[PDB]
Design a protein around this ligand. Structure first.
Ligand code: OYF
Ligand code: OYF
Lengths: 304, 304
């Protein structure tokens, strides 16, 4: 028993973290096989970031200008190319610690673990979610760029995110491992609207099932609802509309607890309309939306 | 910017995790040098746990009865001994992945990262605190026993905790790496009082400083207090009394923000007496006590 915001074990990802220096800029790189992946803003000075012409800035750079350092050993750069907002540095040595890996583009509402790095060194690991508006509420300081988000299925690491930017609002933006930004963000120090964010409804319901599994049951009630009645409430409270796909993904949790999905929706409706009344659920005074139904099942079953 | 419940990178600890089987019981072991450390209840069946005589149960066991498996390779056990509530299995091979390490006994209120394991395999990592009553609010299922808590200073892992037991209340109890329980707990399936827990005052204040650093300042007020006036309030709300040592440890955060410690105490006093009024601080609707002043400084400075 017990429910925690757990991150995947970070070892397989620590072994890929390298330091990438270009001119005066240093950020983090991801070394998989004979390729180092890093944000393309490694070629910019602070004044370049205002309105950078990346093609033109990269043209002034050569393989010898990119300093890649793994731990304490230098890697020889033999190729460089720009793919969207990432640079791919071909090095002459395959990373001996390259795990089984995939590059995946996660969906809004999905969760992942971030290994925060500075100067190619890992400082911490946390579990977070890709918000519906495609930002992440991370913990990133200067030099954190190039830090990656990932999931782990047994031995295969699915890299899903690379940190690029902190918006003036304090939220974070980044790309998939092909350099495509999540959301409408561009890699420029300019005004950028994050957009209206919503609460991930399926995740809150999943977390309410983890609460019932772990003993916190006070929020359970004598009521039920319909998808449409619940969705009217979700609209009023800036929650993502619940669809039959969300109900279907909640099937395993609904089966384990014996509480129908729409019955749990009625509980969520009452918590939305009445608040917590000074009580807590799984040690939290707000409705948690950073645990997916897959995460709750994984944590309550013990998948390693 | 951004503030997260960050855990240390778990790689150095993943490389020490082994599976320990004795009879029909399997739990996790910690392989450092040529020694595997695991909870001594690995020698018990479920019926033994009611009132076990560990000396007598261990006497029926020989080195060949302890099956230690690292990944997919078996370790040869050449010695066994019981130290308090841990078994030390001398194996014939030193763990090649043994990092620089220390065995430390942490103080109540201090934090650490837990690498949850099942069958010697790491499933997740989370940051938690040793409660003032010496329990931990972890996330542990059957087979999690032998999972360890630790801190990391550059390259040195300080092992501070080994999971042993889940109390009927759903809280967790365990030992230091010499087998000494934190708190009054015994390794028996019997009624065990956890004791009155309190909120770690210094940690809440530290987290309030991290909120000011990161922008959440609404809770700041035109008031100040004294250690004694604040402590009367702390008493009423089951908060640990604040001492001059706590004020002293808050010095760096007080210096960074320019907000005197007793001025932040006055803010905490008002939050205790008036609640949050439906607002949040660092995305939380309650006062967080699982970040020490050292953790806030580390996270806001970027120590790797
Ligand atoms: O965001 C960036 N810096 C950081 C990232 N994350 C966290 C931080 C925290 N504190 C200072 C800086 C940070 C860089 C530098 C600023 O201008 C831009 C503009 C667009 C892009 Cl793609 C990157 C950057
Ligand atoms: O606590 C224990 N089991 C677990 C630990 N942690 C989490 C769990 C979750 N779910 C089932 C079991 C768990 C073992 C077995 C029960 O009897 C005792 C009594 C004292 C001692 Cl020292 C250990 C044990």
């Amino acid at each position: 028993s017990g429910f925690r915001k757990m991150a995947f074990p970070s070892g397989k990802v620590e072994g890929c973290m390298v330091q990438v220096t270009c001119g005066t800029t240093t950020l983090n790189g991801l070394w998989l096989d004979d390729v180092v992946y890093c944000p393309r803003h490694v070629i910019c000075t602070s004044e370049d970031m205002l309105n950078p012409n990346y093609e033109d800035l990269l043209i002034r750079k050569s393989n010898h200008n990119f300093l890649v350092q793994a731990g304490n050993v230098q890697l020889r750069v033999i190729g460089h190319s720009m793919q969207n907002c990432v640079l791919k540095l071909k090095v002459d040595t395959a990373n001996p610690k390259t795990p089984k890996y995939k590059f995946v583009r996660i969906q809004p509402g999905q969760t992942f673990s971030v290994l925060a790095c500075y100067n190619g060194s890992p400082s911490g690991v946390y579990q977070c979610a890709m918000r519906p508006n495609f930002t992440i509420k991370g913990s990133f300081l200067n030099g954190s760029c190039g830090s990656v988000g990932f999931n782990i299925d047994y031995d295969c690491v699915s890299f899903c995110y690379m940190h690029h930017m902190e918006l003036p609002t304090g939220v974070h933006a980044g790309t998939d491992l092909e350099g495509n930004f999540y959301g409408p963000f561009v890699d420029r120090q300019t005004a950028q609207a994050a957009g209206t964010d919503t609460t991930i409804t399926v995740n809150v319901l999943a977390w309410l099932y983890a609460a019932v599994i772990n003993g916190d049951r006070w929020f359970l009630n004598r009521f039920t609802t319909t998808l449409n009645d619940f969705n009217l409430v979700a609209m009023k409270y800036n929650y993502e509309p619940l669809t039959q796909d969300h109900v279907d993904i909640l099937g395993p949790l609904s089966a384990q607890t014996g509480i129908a999905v729409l019955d749990m929706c009625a509980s969520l409706k009452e918590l939305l309309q009445n608040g917590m009344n000074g009580r807590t659920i799984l040690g939290s005074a707000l409705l948690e939306d950073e645990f997916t139904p897959f995460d709750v099942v994984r944590q309550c079953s013990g998948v390693t």
